[PDB]
């Protein structure tokens, strides 16, 4: 019963992190469309260039977070994939150990929502830039 | 493909009483056929990607001149 319940909790965390990954994929492709449209009326102009710089660095920060979500889904799918009678199972040297990068659920998802909110912020400010230049 | 098919041959050295056919034989032959099929489809799609990049290079050659 405890092994079945551990499988249920692990699948629940998988279903959370995949949702975060796909919604950041949506934000990434919207940023790609935004940088291309802002370039296509770049071809005031100094302000356009400096918000291009801000938009590029925001894109790279969400790209780093997206790569982190990719590898996290790979680790959790593999951990549910492994089961009884495989060679990888072993007694561990220290199972119970809290490593250096200890953070909590609330701080983790407020950080992810925080950089999404920054992304949406410069998208919107770029929209009134788009309409002012046009 | 390495690991699965040498798993098959390294299994099949067995003596007379345990020379049998369990589910492991059937799952392993299904494994090696489907991995072979994955090889052929990825090879074909790599070939079509090469052809697409040929068309890209040809359009570059005719567009940088003009």
């Amino acid at each position: 019963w405890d092994e079945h319940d551990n499988r249920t909790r692990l699948a629940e965390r998988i279903d959370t992190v995949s949702r975060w990954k796909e919604m950041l994929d949506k934000c990434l492709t919207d940023l790609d469309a935004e940088i291309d449209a802002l370039a296509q009326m770049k071809e005031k102009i100094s302000q356009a260039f400096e918000k291009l710089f801000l938009l590029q660095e925001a894109r790279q920060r969400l790209n780093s977070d997206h790569r982190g979500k990719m590898e996290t889904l790979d680790i959790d799918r593999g951990c549910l994939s492994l089961n009884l009678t495989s060679p990888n199972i072993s007694l561990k040297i220290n199972p119970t150990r809290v490593p250096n990068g200890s953070t909590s659920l609330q701080q983790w998802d407020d950080l992810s929502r925080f950089n999404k909110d920054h992304g949406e912020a410069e998208m919107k400010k770029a929209i009134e830039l788009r309409e002012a230049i046009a | 493909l390495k690991v699965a098919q040498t798993r098959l041959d390294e299994r099949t050295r067995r003596p007379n009483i345990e020379l049998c056919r369990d589910m492991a034989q059937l799952r392993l032959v299904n494994e090696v056929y489907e991995v072979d099929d994955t090889i052929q489809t990825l090879q074909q799609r790599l070939r079509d990607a090469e052809d697409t990049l040929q068309s890209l290079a040809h359009t570059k050659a005719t567009l940088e001149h003009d």
Binding site: - | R21, M23, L26, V29, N30, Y33, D37, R45, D48, D51, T52, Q54, S55, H58, T59
Partner: protein, 104 residues
Amino acid sequence: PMGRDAAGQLWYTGLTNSDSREAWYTLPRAPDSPYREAYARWHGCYGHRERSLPSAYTQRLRETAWYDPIIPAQYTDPSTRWGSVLWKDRPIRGKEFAINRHRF
């Protein structure tokens, strides 16, 4: 025995033809019955593991050869077996190239 005493004796095996499957009406056991516990438990776990494979891979584990000789099954394989159609688009400058005309 190997002696001057010698007898030709037939003997019948246990779960073959002499035992039955469990139920609540036949519940506890009769001690006289040839209930072969080792084969019963092994065949129980074998059936638990056996129910996962589909039916052609079950009838390959039978004695007589009623199985299809070609290993990939019809209902599992997405591709047609020995189908001749394969859409190859010739690269010509101009019109649009495309992929996967089998599944549009």
